[PDB]
């Protein structure tokens, strides 16, 4: 790596790991379009297995960026429209509160207060229909953004209905394969288990538990190499050969709603660059990031803005992830750890690094 | 051309020219991506000059397709947003009816009843300001569509302000040049007058008159070759090398509003394909039809299975362009008489339906 990349990464990430007591960490910096990789510590503390370029980490809510782009691709294929009623694709969802809730509201957490989590007790398809049929909204559609796994989770499940493919099969064949993400999985197969990091929570080794709509909201596992490729793809979508995927990545960075200084994409969130770092740093703390906020519709949505900070945080019980990039600067960063440590500390580190390099 | 293309075109266009008494016509069929050209009759009856592939015709309102694409390319550049208020780009528009009227409303005829024509007495840009300030909407913004040159014409004018270029210069540098439309003009240069057809209105030779926002709403002249290249560009925007233009073409074919079976783009109008030919044939015809619109929220990106089209007339010319992206199929009809729109649509549908 150029010395200026090594110096700012070492000075920022290495101390963060000490401060947060992170067992293992991989970071990619994309600089003038090319990836540079850094690794620390252990994937599995008991085995003393080092983090490598092949180590798979739980991306947690970073998965929503794959879901947003898979939906973007289905729109480009003309299979779905974000203006369509949710009930077009789930004809069994007939209760009256759903009138007026569209795929756009599910994808952007604006349906009117669908809950942060799908309840743990929901296990079957039948449980899931009953939970949505029984949900009562806190606000009208398209008035309030409330971050919610049960919102974008349902979007992803419905987006793939026209294709007839399972969500996993659509994600593999339409997104992971065309981008050569060859070590990225919704369900880690036996061959990859030896590379699958353990997460650490209260010192115990953990992996995420099965949950309804887990694949669509928080279920992707990936390596630092494949996430570097994912950043590159989202930095420069016109390089992607497959027309509908190139389109889908562009649609996932369109600005659909504005709250404060952020804009909501499909999975991705965006702010103009240069950003106020205190804004993304404080905004990432869960007391703000999970609060309801009033949205202004952006009518029609602004196409992807090059001069943006585009980012997403993600956590599972044992893992904490962050991805951020600025298309205009051909610059990005991926940070994967096998401990769930506070968001502001991720955003602050990533900001220090990217701001040094632009 | 392949004998089947030849035969469908000639058995359609021959009787059209006879029945409508058209003095000169040029047609291009785009079939599997490649252009095939046909020409008939006279560009200049008095001078006995035939229509050729280099004859310029007035496109009339087909010019709005170039204005919608130039707008789409300005949005792709980040210079404007369709969600911007009009007053952002013309802050002298202080009259209170302008609050809430966006560039999207201007581009799609939904501002609330701006009129079809800018009145003839509007010359200067101060007369133009006074016209817009004094205009009284019939409706709230985004509730009814009323086709209007004064609506998309102002959109064209404002969309280029951040660029710092004249509308003509932006159109030249950002659309005509990149697409090698080198015989397409807002103002026909002296060197190209020998190729400018006359239009014919009641047997008299006529050309379009200057008027305010003419360039933006109805003032482009072009050849059948350059119009075939325009149709190719709109059929396959992914082949275009300039990234903002490729995107601008896509934005112009997004579906912003629905009324009946038709969707409004930026300049272009679209229907799902296959189309009921009655929907487009009668649909193309009335001096004012005000139609309620449903917003497409958010707009649908350009749908490949569409019949995408635009009609156009000036006092002496009648033009039509239609294409179907998923079949790589298109047609351009240019004539130097303004004959009824249903006759245009009917011919076009009878040709393209036969070729797919
Ligand atoms: C995605 O990461 C998702 N959690 C998935 O398991 C979101 N991120 C959170 C976080 O940043 O920590 C969430 C914490 O939720 C709480 C504190 O209840 C949940 S939503
Ligand atoms: C463009 O062609 C424009 N005339 C410009 O000089 C419009 N042309 C019409 C037409 O195609 O005949 C118009 C019909 O008006 C309606 C009701 O759409 C509008 S003026």
């Amino acid at each position: 790596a150029p010395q200026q990349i090594n110096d700012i990464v070492h000075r920022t990430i290495t101390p963060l790991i000490e401060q947060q007591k992170i067992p293992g960490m991989a970071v990619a910096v994309i600089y003038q379009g090319k990836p540079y990789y850094f690794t620390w510590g252990y994937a599995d503390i008991a085995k003393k297995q080092p983090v490598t370029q092949q180590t798979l980490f739980e991306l947690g809510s970073v998965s929503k960026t794959f879901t947003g782009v898979l939906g973007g691709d289905a729109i480009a294929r003309g299979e779905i429209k974000l203006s369509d009623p949710t009930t077009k694709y789930w004809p069994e969802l007939t209760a009256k509160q759903w009138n007026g809730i569209t795929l756009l509201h599910l994808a952007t957490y604006t349906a009117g207060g669908l809950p942060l989590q799908v309840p743990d007790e929901v296990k079957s398809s039948s449980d899931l229909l009953r939970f949505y049929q029984n949900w009562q909204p806190a606000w009208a559609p398209g008035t309030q953004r409330l971050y919610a796994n049960s919102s974008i989770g349902l979007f992803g499940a419905l987006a793939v209905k026209p294709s007839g493919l399972s969500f996993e099969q659509a994600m593999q064949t339409r997104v992971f394969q065309p981008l050569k993400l060859n070590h990225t999985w919704i369900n880690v197969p036996p061959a990859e288990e030896k590379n699958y990091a353990w997460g650490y929570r209260e010192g115990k080794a953990v992996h995420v538990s099965p949950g309804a709509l887990d694949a669509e909201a928080y279920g992707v596992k990936s390596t630092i190499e494949d996430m570097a490729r994912w950043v590159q793809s989202n930095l420069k979508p016109l390089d992607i050969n497959e027309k509908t995927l190139q389109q889908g990545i562009q649609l996932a960075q369109s600005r659909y709603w504005q709250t404060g200084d952020m804009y909501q994409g499909l999975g991705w969130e965006m702010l103009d660059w240069p950003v106020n770092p205190d804004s993304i740093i404080n905004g990432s703390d869960n007391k703000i990031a999970l609060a309801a906020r009033p949205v202004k519709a952006i009518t029609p949505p602004t196409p992807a803005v090059r001069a943006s900070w585009v980012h997403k945080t993600g956590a599972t019980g044992g893992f904490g992830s962050y991805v951020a990039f600025i298309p205009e600067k051909e610059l990005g960063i991926v940070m994967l750890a096998n401990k769930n440590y506070p968001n502001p500390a991720r955003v602050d580190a990533a900001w220090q690094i990217l701001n040094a390099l632009q």
Side-chain angles (χ1 to χ4, degrees), chain A residues 1-20 22-33 35-46 48 50-122 124-201 203 205-242 244-295 297-358:
Chain A
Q3 180 273 339
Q4 63 276 10
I5 295 185
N6 285 337
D7 172 53
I8 191 59
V9 171
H10 189 34
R11 289 178 342 90
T12 310
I13 301 298
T14 305
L16 175 66
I17 290 171
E18 292 306 294
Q19 301 155 18
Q20 293 293 340
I22 290 157
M25 189 146 195
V27 165
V29 162
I30 299 73
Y31 176 79
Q32 308 179 352
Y36 300 97
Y37 301 99
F38 306 81
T39 59
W40 300 258
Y42 295 123
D44 179 326
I45 292 172
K48 292 164 190 278
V51 172
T52 69
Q53 270 135 63
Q54 298 303 45
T55 294
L56 275 76
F57 288 83
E58 296 173 1
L59 301 185
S61 295
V62 173
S63 304
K64 296 179 170 80
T65 63
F66 293 96
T67 301
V69 172
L70 178 69
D73 176 83
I75 298 167
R77 287 169 181 267
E79 283 170 356
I80 66 175
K81 306 179 214 284
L82 289 171
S83 56
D84 280 344
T86 297
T87 309
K88 179 162 206 272
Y89 318 85
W90 201 354
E92 300 75 18
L93 188 73
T94 50
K96 65 199 183 172
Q97 71 270 25
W98 285 92
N99 269 88
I101 293 179
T102 64
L103 297 185
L104 179 58
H105 290 137
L106 303 178
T108 54
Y109 316 125
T110 53
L114 280 171
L116 178 64
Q117 257 98 32
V118 176
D120 219 84
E121 297 90 339
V122 173
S124 59
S125 328
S126 180
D127 289 343
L128 195 67
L129 174 55
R130 194 152 157 183
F131 157 69
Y132 287 117
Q133 283 284 72
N134 278 329
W135 165 83
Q136 287 302 328
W139 308 282
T143 60
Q144 307 291 337
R145 175 183 181 281
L146 182 78
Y147 187 92
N149 286 345
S150 70
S151 193
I152 191 173
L154 180 63
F155 173 66
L158 304 182
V160 295
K161 287 303 177 168
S163 80
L165 304 170
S166 57
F167 186 77
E168 180 169 30
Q169 283 305 304
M171 183 73 77
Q172 286 185 10
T173 59
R174 296 171 168 199
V175 178
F176 296 166
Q177 288 168 5
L179 302 180
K180 298 189 190 159
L181 306 186
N182 294 343
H183 298 281
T184 292
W185 295 94
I186 286 167
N187 293 296
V188 178
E192 286 281 21
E193 285 173 16
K194 73 180 200 300
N195 296 318
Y196 185 5
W198 284 100
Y200 293 92
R201 187 185 185 259
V206 292
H207 279 151
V208 62
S209 306
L213 302 178
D214 58 359
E216 299 90 341
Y218 59 83
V220 179
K221 298 94 198 175
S222 188
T223 70
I224 198 68
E225 296 205 337
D226 280 10
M227 293 300 294
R229 294 186 66 87
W230 180 241
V231 173
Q232 293 183 307
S233 301
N234 284 269
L235 270 171
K236 218 164 179 152
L238 300 166
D239 279 352
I240 299 167
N241 299 359
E242 292 78 7
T244 57
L245 179 56
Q246 171 185 121
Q247 196 169 332
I249 297 262
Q250 293 163 333
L251 290 172
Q253 282 167 65
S254 290
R255 297 172 171 199
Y256 297 89
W257 305 92
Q258 177 171 13
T259 181
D261 56 359
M262 143 261 292
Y263 304 86
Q264 180 64 54
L266 309 172
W268 295 113
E269 292 164 22
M270 292 87 52
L271 291 93
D272 285 313
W273 177 267
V275 311
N276 177 355
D278 291 320
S279 185
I280 53 178
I281 299 162
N282 302 323
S284 74
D285 186 294
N286 292 336
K287 83 192 150 177
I288 294 191
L290 311 177
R293 296 265 182 275
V295 278
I298 299 171
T299 307
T302 305
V305 173
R306 301 244 316 147
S308 298
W309 181 268
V310 188
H311 71 156
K312 184 68 181 89
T313 58
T316 59
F319 282 86
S321 61
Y322 184 52
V323 172
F325 57 94
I326 305 160
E328 190 188 61
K329 307 249 178 250
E330 318 185 317
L331 190 55
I333 189 168
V334 189
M335 288 162 62
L336 310 175
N338 61 354
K339 173 165 186 199
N340 184 2
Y341 61 109
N343 289 329
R346 312 190 205 164
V347 185
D348 174 70
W351 155 271
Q352 295 299 331
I353 291 165
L354 294 189
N355 189 49
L357 295 179
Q358 44 104 27

